[PDB]
Amino acid sequence: QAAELFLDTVSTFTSYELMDYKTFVTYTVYVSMIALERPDLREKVIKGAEILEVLHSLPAVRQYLFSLYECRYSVFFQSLAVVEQEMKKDWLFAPHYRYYVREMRIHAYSQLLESYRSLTLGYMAEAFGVGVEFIDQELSRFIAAGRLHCKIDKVNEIVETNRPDSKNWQYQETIKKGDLLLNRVQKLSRVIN
């Protein structure tokens, strides 16, 4: 709900005093790539002529923006380390920036290896220049979470990726979901009503 609402708003509120701009379009262009879907309205972010001219004066979030779709990721992790220094400001803070760097990170890796049926160690090392163990421990933590489909196939040091689709996504989603829902009712539907 945050990006689109922001995205399709323009913002003006009694001389934008709660908007406190030099903040708003930035907040959009680093709230977008969490949930605004990378093909769909990310073009509406980029080729949308309402925001691109006011991030023109804001080159840091600009080079944070066109360093995803242009795959220049040796500057994108640099650009995201900037955001983890201006995470300090906003009072909506702590699991928002830890989760935020988590999902910028995971969306960045999942964007790369999805186009390939096999990902080599040298080309994944080419993403920044981090080498091996950053990708190894980190991606093993991500598949420990199971939120990408890759696996650290060190037998050849080439990462494999097919895609089991989101038919199973639902099942896994709804076990927990269902449980929680019933539990709430289980919290109520006893004598205490």
């Binding site: 380390a81 760097v101 988590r102 080498g131």
Partner: peptide
């Protein structure tokens, strides 16, 4: 918040891991 985060164990984040990453490479 109220969607369960990890926030557990991990040493200083992608700023410092970025820093010793590019410094350890170079």
């Amino acid at each position: 918040v109220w969607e369960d985060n990890w926030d557990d164990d991990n040493v200083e984040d992608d700023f410092s891991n970025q820093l010793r990453a590019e410094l350890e490479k170079h």
